[PDB]
Amino acid sequence: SIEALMLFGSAARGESDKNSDVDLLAVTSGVRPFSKKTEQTELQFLNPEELLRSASDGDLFAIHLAFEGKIIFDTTGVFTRFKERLVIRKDYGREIKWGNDLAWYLLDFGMNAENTTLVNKRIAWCVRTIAIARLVESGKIIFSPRALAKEFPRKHVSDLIGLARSDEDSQTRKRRLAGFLDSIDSSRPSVSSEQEYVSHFERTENRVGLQTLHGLKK
Amino acid sequence: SIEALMLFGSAARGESDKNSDVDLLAVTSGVRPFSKKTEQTELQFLNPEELLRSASDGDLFAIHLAFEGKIIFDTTGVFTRFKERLVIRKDYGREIKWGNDLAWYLLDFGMNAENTTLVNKRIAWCVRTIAIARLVESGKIIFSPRALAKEFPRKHVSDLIGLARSEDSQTRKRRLAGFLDSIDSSRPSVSSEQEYVSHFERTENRVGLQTLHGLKK
Amino acid sequence: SIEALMLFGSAARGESDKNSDVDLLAVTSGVRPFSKKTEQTELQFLNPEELLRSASDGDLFAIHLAFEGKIIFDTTGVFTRFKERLVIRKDYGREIKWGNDLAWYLLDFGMNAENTTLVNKRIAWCVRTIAIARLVESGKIIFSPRALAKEFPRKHVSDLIGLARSDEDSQTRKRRLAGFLDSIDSSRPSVSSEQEYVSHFERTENRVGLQTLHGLK
Amino acid sequence: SIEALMLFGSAARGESDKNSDVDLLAVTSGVRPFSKKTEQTELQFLNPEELLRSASDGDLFAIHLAFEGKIIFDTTGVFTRFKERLVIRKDYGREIKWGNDLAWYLLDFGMNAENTTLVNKRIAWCVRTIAIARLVESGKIIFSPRALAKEFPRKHVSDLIGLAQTRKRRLAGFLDSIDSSRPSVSEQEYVSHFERTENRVGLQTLHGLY
Ligand SMILES: Nc1ncnc2c1ncn2[C@@H]1C[C@H](O)[C@H](COP(=O)(O)Oc2ccc(C[C@@H](NC(=O)[C@@H]3CCCN3)C(=O)O)cc2)O1
Ligand SMILES: Nc1ncnc2c1ncn2[C@H]1C[C@H](O)[C@H](COP(=O)(O)Oc2ccc(C[C@H](N)C(=O)O)cc2)O1
Ligand SMILES: Nc1ncnc2c1ncn2[C@H]1C[C@H](O)[C@@H](COP(=O)(O)CP(=O)(O)OP(=O)(O)O)O1
Ligand SMILES: Nc1ncnc2c1ncn2[C@H]1C[C@H](O)[C@@H](COP(=O)(O)CP(=O)(O)OP(=O)(O)O)O1
Ligand SMILES: Nc1ncnc2c1ncn2[C@H]1C[C@H](O)[C@@H](COP(=O)(O)CP(=O)(O)OP(=O)(O)O)O1
Ligand SMILES: Nc1ncnc2c1ncn2[C@H]1C[C@H](O)[C@@H](COP(=O)(O)CP(=O)(O)OP(=O)(O)O)O1
Ligand SMILES: Nc1ncnc2c1ncn2[C@H]1C[C@H](O)[C@@H](COP(=O)(O)O)O1
Ligand SMILES: [Mn+2]
Ligand SMILES: [Mn+2]
Ligand SMILES: [Mn+2]
Ligand SMILES: [Mn+2]
Ligand SMILES: [Mn+2]
Ligand SMILES: [Mn+2]
Ligand SMILES: [Mn+2]
Ligand SMILES: [Mn+2]
């Protein structure tokens, strides 16, 4: 069964934009994490242990749930134990490195891939993650696209996050992503071939990078 | 887009158990009415015009949304315009007869159908529709399966409504016949499955037409 | 200890304005009903037994809590037993008659009273009670001032309810209350003076009439 | 006039006991901060500019509202602008010092004062402000009395905070357990100390006679 249900995302902030979705977190035991999208809705499924682990580890997403989430119902108090476990870290350089390195892979290999929508979705994930992580290190808790652009005013932050649900395949994405990486003083990881990025993602445990690279194939 | 979102059903009452689903209503403009079931969740999609019509027509489901629904968000105020349009009727005999007639068909043809799940679900619909309507007529707003059996205490109400969540099969026909007796029900003047199709079309029993043709699939 | 808190009124409808208050209902065990107003906040205190009684008696205020109230927290489920006990009556002529009789007393004696604020509050109470009850009798659940004037289109409904928080002493209030009473085919009860209004309110169990009458003095 | 309403405190955590209150925050334009207490309810009134200031200055109480408060309604979106302005400070030693100095004053002079109630309220504030400051510096967000004693397990932490006879023995036992140092101060030198260190709560308490 489903122990608890939380509204998060822009709907929990009372904000909306052109193609906004509705974000719902369903806590149910004995299931591996997954999500289902259905006509502008998004259902995120987590088991209770994974929810508590994200708080103990100080996941940026866990910070969002505790900062802006709204409980719809909670029959087990799992969201209370979730907030009790939350430990906000002082250093998110690991998350910054993941978004940094995947941005370089997408720059080197993603701009002509067939799955344009996945590239755009994950280009935004890179810029979003770096912006969220850098702001938390500075003592701020920011998650909305409009506020990330104002609080982390690097080159093309708004444009690149705006790709999150776009099928835009213009080559101006490559020039803008390169300008953003330059504005944050990014350096490409010591890799070249696609196979080397795979090994580097494994070495640095960049799960989203591995999922993105493999997902672009088919 | 999605203007408003409402939690309804047993979760909105804090009465979810093990077999319970999670009921969510999403108001989206332009979409045709449909539902989607995903891992114990049920998403109901309506356009604003359809939502207001159910209020003006005093639909039993609309009374549930207005009485027990818990608004999660509503950017357009559509739920307020929904409640201002609500007109509870003093007479729900039309809805009562729809469930009464379909109950007779399921008693006469559904007890040995292949799709046992659909028959069990639609048997629960007949009993629940009748219980809800009778209680609204007396001035009560009741929708919990447990409270429907206490406030509408007819024979086997809890057992038959429980058939949606499914059990003592092959005694269902006896329990359904017992319920039809306790409500002083009468079978409509039909005696063929085609005569049931004809009766459902005259009386505009859409749930019956869907049920009958759904058992053939 | 406060076991449950509910938001009601216009804030729960998402349509409060600059002149609105914030309506909060607090349930505390072993306490008699009373109200405390604080910097445009209104705190209503009830015990669980009084709350559930208003549902069983079908109080018009209880209908509002059930169809428009939003729970802030509820550690005892008292709002769940509240809704299970609700019984909407087919007739509210008693509440209508209470509002009519008090309106006539204010018209006959209150238009030059010292406590103008109390008179303006209870004038709005009379018209609101009558409008709410009539709309409930017709199967509708209306409570906001704007919708009451639209759904109960009688003379000066909007103006008279607008006196709720007004210190206006103009005699135009008296002419408007008379025009309203004439539009609902109201008739003054067979009472001569102020003492006969007292004996009438006591005989007819008009608690609000007795409270208002002695409130001016 | 009231544009936003928020529930905070233990009721927002669903952890109210027999002696709890109901904490409500009302944002009202053009008012000075003040609070009304009505039959176990606590209404706190703020203007939007003051609410955003507490976020920009990283007030401990602002962090509580952002991570634990439950919005009842918000007609202006001020709570989102409130959360956008939040800047968690890298250090809260200033707050810890304020609570430490006042505790030493109350230990040296307030254990037999007339207003026994006010002494118990400010003593709890000292221990609570110190505990909450530790929790924020460590990245935690649950400011309940049980969480404070659990995460800050010094002697008699739950006893002192639980003060809303034996009070002196356990207050000194707390200062000893945290290796606290009394500031170099008489009761008149405690005044000159709070004034120099800008301990507002220490000033208003001593004159008692978020
Ligand atoms: N821990 C998280 N971190 C970052 N954001 C998260 C997290 N949880 C939920 N969200 C939000 C919700 C919001 O809606 C946004 C959509 O944007 P996103 O680009 O999908 O971001 C990601 C989404 C999921 C993952 C986890 C997993 N991938 C997947 O399960 C599927 C498989 C194909 C498509 N993804 C993985 O690789 O480990 C990683 C990134 O994601
Ligand atoms: N008008 C409503 N009456 C009762 N319930 C409704 C209604 N609308 C939505 N619901 C949800 C809430 C609950 O979950 C209930 C259980 O479903 P039921 O199957 O028992 O009852 C139905 C069977 C058929 C239909 C027709 C629909 N076009 C379809 O093709 O299905 C509709 C309902 O359905
Ligand atoms: N890369 C990331 N790292 C950590 N947390 C992240 C994240 N991306 C999103 N989040 C968090 C915050 C979102 O508000 C929230 C929903 O993520 P989302 O993809 O739905 C974007 P949202 O803020 O809802 O605006 P909208 O376009 O849908 O209207 O999940
Ligand atoms: N035949 C009918 N006529 C009018 N309204 C009806 C209805 N059947 C259900 N409803 C209303 C009320 C349900 O609570 C609500 C959800 O319908 P549901 O099928 O999910 C049964 P529920 O009350 O949620 O308990 P559970 O077994 O899921 O835990 O939809
Ligand atoms: N005479 C009556 N009979 C039955 N119920 C009555 C009632 N008067 C008020 N109510 C119910 C409904 C109000 O919305 C609700 C709050 O009553 P209220 O006096 O605060 C008027 P409200 O609807 O909130 O608009 P606003 O002027 O404050 O912006 O209490
Ligand atoms: N000295 C301080 N510095 C910063 N923040 C402080 C604070 N004292 C209290 N807070 C925050 C957190 C409380 O939950 C809340 C105070 O509310 P409260 O003083 O009523 C204690 P509470 O946590 O609600 O439990 P209970 O005893 O009422 O049941 O506001
Ligand atoms: N029984 C009842 N009737 C109407 N309003 C009620 C009642 N009980 C509480 N209230 C609340 C609702 C109003 O906002 C307010 C004005 O009541 P008023 O009596 O108009 O001064 O007091
Ligand atoms: Mn979203
Ligand atoms: Mn999303
Ligand atoms: Mn359900
Ligand atoms: Mn359902
Ligand atoms: Mn009001
Ligand atoms: Mn009021
Ligand atoms: Mn409190
Ligand atoms: Mn308090």
- Dist CA B211 CA B10 (whole Å): 24
Beta pairing, strands A22-28 & A41-46: parallel
- Do D70 and D103 fall into the same domain? no
- Claim to verify: residue B80 and residue B97 sit in the same structural domain: no
- Give contacts of D 150-209 with A, CB under 8 A: none
Looking up tokens 């010292």 gives C114
Length of chain B as a residue count: 217
Q: What six digits make up the tokens of C140?
A: 């509708």
Report the distance separating Cα B102 and Cα C74, nearest Å: 40
Helix (H), strand (E) at residue B11 = none
Q: Are the C-beta atoms of residues D101 and D199 closer than 8 Å to each other?
A: yes
In this structure, the answer to whether residues A111 and A201 fall within a common structural domain is: yes
- Please choose, from the candidates C192, C186, C202, the residue with its C-alpha nearest in 3D space to the C-alpha of residue C100: C186
Q: Which parts of chain B are beta strand (E)?
A: 2-8, 22-28, 34-38, 41-46, 70-74
In C100-124, which positions are buried (b, 16+ CB within 10 angstroms) versus exposed (e)? bbbbbbbbeebbeeeebebbbbbbb
Q: Is the CB of C53 under 6 A from ligand 7?
A: no
| Position C81, amino acid | R
For C140, the 3-state DSSP assignment is coil
A141 touches chain D (CB under 8 A): yes
In whole angstroms, give the CA distance from residue C188 to residue C101.
7
**DSSP label of D82:** H
**B28 - beta bridge partners?**
B2
How many residues does the structure list for chain D?
Answer: 210
The answer to whether the CB of C144 is under 6 A from ligand 5 is yes
Q: Measured between alpha carbons, how far is A183 from A127 in angstroms, rounded to an integer?
A: 12
DSSP, collapsed to helix, strand or coil, labels residue D180 as coil
User: 3-state DSSP call for residue B65?
Assistant: helix
Residue where a domain terminates, one of A34, A68, A85: A85
Closest CA to B34 of D157, D25, A41: A41
The angle, 0 to 180 degrees and rounded to 10, between the axes of the packed helices C194-203 and C93-109 is 170
Same domain, A80 and A138: no
Q: How many structural domains are present in chain A?
A: 2
Contact B67 C77 (CB under 8 A): no
Distance, in Å, from the CA atom of C107 to the CA atom of C177, rounded to the nearest integer, reads 7
Residues D78 and D99 in one domain: no
Compute the distance between CA of residue B111 and CA of residue B171 in angstroms, rounded to an integer. 10
Q: Are D174 and D191 in contact (CB under 8 A)?
A: no
The residue among D56, D84, D112 that closes a domain is D84
User: Rounded CA gap, C157 and C135, in Å?
Assistant: 13
3-state secondary structure chain A: CEEEEEEECHHHHCCCCCCCCEEEEEEECCCCCEEEEECCEEEEEECHHHHHHHHHCCCHHHHHHHHHCEEEEECCCHHHHHHHHCCCCCCCHHHHHHHHHHHHHHHHHHCCCCCHHHHHHHHHHHHHHHHHHHHHHCCCCCCCHHHHHHHCCCCCHHHHHHHHHCCCCCCHHHHHHHHHHHHCCCCCCCCCCHHHHHHHHHHCCCHHHHHHHHHHHC
Examine the domain organization and report whether A18 and A43 are in the same domain: yes
All residues of chain A having their beta carbon less than 8 Å from the beta carbon of residue D77 are 14
Q: Residue B179: name the closest of B103, B92, B97, B120 by CA.
A: B103
Q: Are residues D97 and D168 in the same domain?
A: yes
Question: Which residue bears the tokens 């406030």?
Answer: B151
**Are residues A166 and A81 part of one domain?**
no
What is the span of the domain harbouring residue D19?
A: 2-84
Distance B195 CA to ligand 7 centre (A): 57
Ligand nearest to the CA of A119: 1
How many angstroms separate the CA atoms of B16 and B10, rounded?
5
Rounded Cα distance between C182 and A166, Å, is 64
Q: Are residues A165 and A102 in the same domain?
A: yes
Q: Among C38, C66, C84, give the residue marking a domain's end.
A: C84
Q: Which helix (H) or strand (E) holds B132?
A: helix B116-137
Q: Torsion angle of alpha carbons C115, C116, C118, C119, nearest 10°?
A: 120
Same domain, B113 and B211: yes
Taking the Cβ of residue B141 and every Cβ of chain C, the question of whether any pair is shorter than 8 Å is answered with yes
CATH number at residue A71: 3.30.460.10
Structure tokens, A80: 């209370």
In chain D, residues 40-79 whose CB comes closer than 8 Å to chain C: 40-41, 43, 45, 70, 72-73, 75
CA angle B132, B135, B136 (to 5 degrees): 85
CA distance D65 to D79: 9
* C77 and C98 assigned to the same domain: no
Inspect the interface and report whether the beta carbons of A38 and B43 lie closer than 8 Å. yes
* Residues pairing with C99 in the sheet: none
In sequence order, the 6+-apart residues with CB closer than 8 A to the CB of D180 are: D100, D103, D104, D174
Count the alpha carbons within 13 Å of C157 in the hemisphere toward its beta carbon: 19
* Tokens 């927290």 -> residue: C73
Please provide residue B5's backbone torsions phi and psi, each rounded to the nearest 5 degrees: -140, 130
Which residues, including other chains, have CB under 8 Å from residue A45's CB and lie 6 or more apart? A26, A28, A31, A33, A34, A35, A36, B39
DSSP 8-state code for residue B42: E
- Please give the resolution of this entry in Å, rounded to 1 decimal: 2.4
User: Distance (Å, rounded) from C-alpha A11 to C-alpha B28?
Assistant: 14
The residue whose CA is least distant from atom 25 of ligand 4 is: B10
Residue A208 burial (CB count, 10 A)? 17
- C79/C108 same-domain check: no
Task: Give the CA-trace dihedral at D137, D138, D144, D145, to 10 degrees.
Answer: -90
Q: At what angle do helices A93-105 and A172-183 cross, to 10 degrees?
A: 150
Cα-based distances in Å from D186 to A54, B207, C29, D196, D201: 51, 86, 49, 15, 18
